[PDB]
Every structure is written in structure tokens, then in C-alpha cells.
């Protein structure tokens, strides 16, 4: 079938190598069982989303929590903490990196839930100190569960990894959490729309701020 592969790297490296290249090393240190039943589903071009319905790729709405905030984000997109040129193994194998999230190449997504009234997986520590929210459009990636279906060690975390990062343009916007009480909603102007999206998740309340490059309030994080 059909897939955008690593379309959405950052990494560069990633980006001029072969998909089959890119595919053998997230599967190289799978065991023989493992390889028996599984496959490395990349997410095909048109795919069967969360409520049954089939949608293009970049209209499966993912989401990032991620603690750096959107003068990094909107700038890099999401970079993986692991960006050199020749990693470990440990370091590119998809099944390591759904079992134990140790420093990768992967930027890890999760798919919004639509069959649950867009309910995403959501991390412990999501109301403690200041989080993002980050609302992704992309093309490509891998799907996790599809690929180890009954070994996926964490299903519910319904992930989509991207080896090599996330563009800045595949993402729409973020809602910025203050101990779990949100702040602003913010809107990447650089973001390329596919259409046919849903308008951004808003109440009348929260402020709607569109970013730019070092915005006075865009760099607020942890320390």
C-alpha cells in the first residue's frame, strides 16, 4: 500500500534515506516471535480512523503533550531527542521505544479518540506545572498497534510514532495548560491546511493568540 512515510521529519539525515532503509531500522531488533506476527504499518495515505470512518492521513487529528512551549515548538516543529547520524540500535527500534520511551529517534503522537468524543490518552503528570497540548495534522508515521496488534505493549496509548520528528507546519495549534487550567489557545499561522478539518476546540472564554517568532508570551515552561 500507499504511504508519506517520513514526509514529516525534521531530521535531515532521516529524510535522504529510503523508506526501506528508515523501515529496517525500526524492525531490526525485533525477535523472530515478534517478526512471526507483526509488520511495520506505516500509516497509509488513506486510513481508517477512530470512529470507523476513512480519512487522508493528514486528517487524522493527533496530539503531542510536550512541556517545551510554541516560540520552540512552532519554530522546530518537534525535533526527537536522538538526531545523529549513527544511533544505537536501542535508539531506532520501534518495539523498545513503544515498550520502554527511552531516548529515540521517535517524536510520539497519540491519535484523538473520536468513537469516545475526541478523548485522547493523556499522560499522569498533564495537570502538574506547564504543558502543552500540541494539535497535529501530519502525513506518514508509524502506527503502533496496527504493527504489533496483540504484543503492542501499551495499547491504549493509541501512538503513532515519527522517526525524525514532526514539521513545524503539520502543526495547527496548542492549548496551553497551568497546572491543568488552560491559558491560551494558540494558532500556528505557518500550519498548511489540508481542509475539511474541524474548527479548533475553543469555549468563549479562553483567548485565541496567534503566534510568531519570539511572541512575549510563547516561552513560558518549566525551570
Not at 74 to 95: A, Q, S
Not at 154 to 167: E, K, R, T, Y
Request: net charge neutral; hydrophobic share 35%; no cysteine.
Amino acid at each position: 500500500y500507499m504511504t508519506n512515510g517520513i514526509q514529516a521529519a525534521v531530521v535531515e539525515w532521516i529524510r535522504a534515506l529510503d523508506l526501506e532503509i528508515i523501515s529496517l531500522l525500526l524492525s531490526r531488533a525485533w525477535p523472530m516471535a515478534l517478526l512471526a506476527t507483526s509488520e511495520l504499518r506505516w500509516r497509509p495515505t488513506v486510513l481508517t480512523d477512530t470512529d470507523n470512518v476513512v480519512r487522508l492521513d493528514r486528517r487524522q487529528r493527533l496530539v503531542r503533550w510536550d512541556r517545551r512551549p510554541p516560540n520552540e515548538i512552532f519554530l522546530d516543529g518537534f525535533v526527537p531527542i536522538v538526531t545523529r547520524e549513527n544511533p544505537d540500535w536501542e535508539e531506532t527500534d520501534l518495539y523498545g521505544f513503544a515498550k520502554n520511551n527511552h531516548p529515540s529517534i521517535f517524536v510520539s503522537t497519540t491519535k484523538t479518540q473520536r468513537n469516545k468524543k475526541k478523548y485522547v490518552w493523556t499522560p499522569r503528570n498533564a495537570n502538574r506545572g506547564i504543558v502543552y497540548q500540541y494539535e497535529i495534522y501530519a502525513p506518514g508515521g508509524v502506527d503502533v498497534n496496527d504493527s504489533f496488534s496483540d504484543a503492542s505493549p501499551w495499547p491504549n496509548q493509541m501512538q503513532v510514532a515519527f522517526p525524525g520528528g514532526i514539521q513545524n507546519i503539520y502543526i495547527r495549534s496548542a492549548r496551553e495548560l497551568h497546572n491543568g487550567r488552560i491559558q491560551r489557545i494558540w494558532i500556528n499561522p505557518n500550519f498548511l491546511d489540508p481542509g475539511d478539518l474541524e474548527p479548533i476546540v475553543s469555549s468563549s472564554r479562553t483567548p485565541q493568540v496567534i503566534w510568531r517568532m519570539n511572541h512575549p508570551d510563547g516561552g513560558h515552561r518549566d525551570q
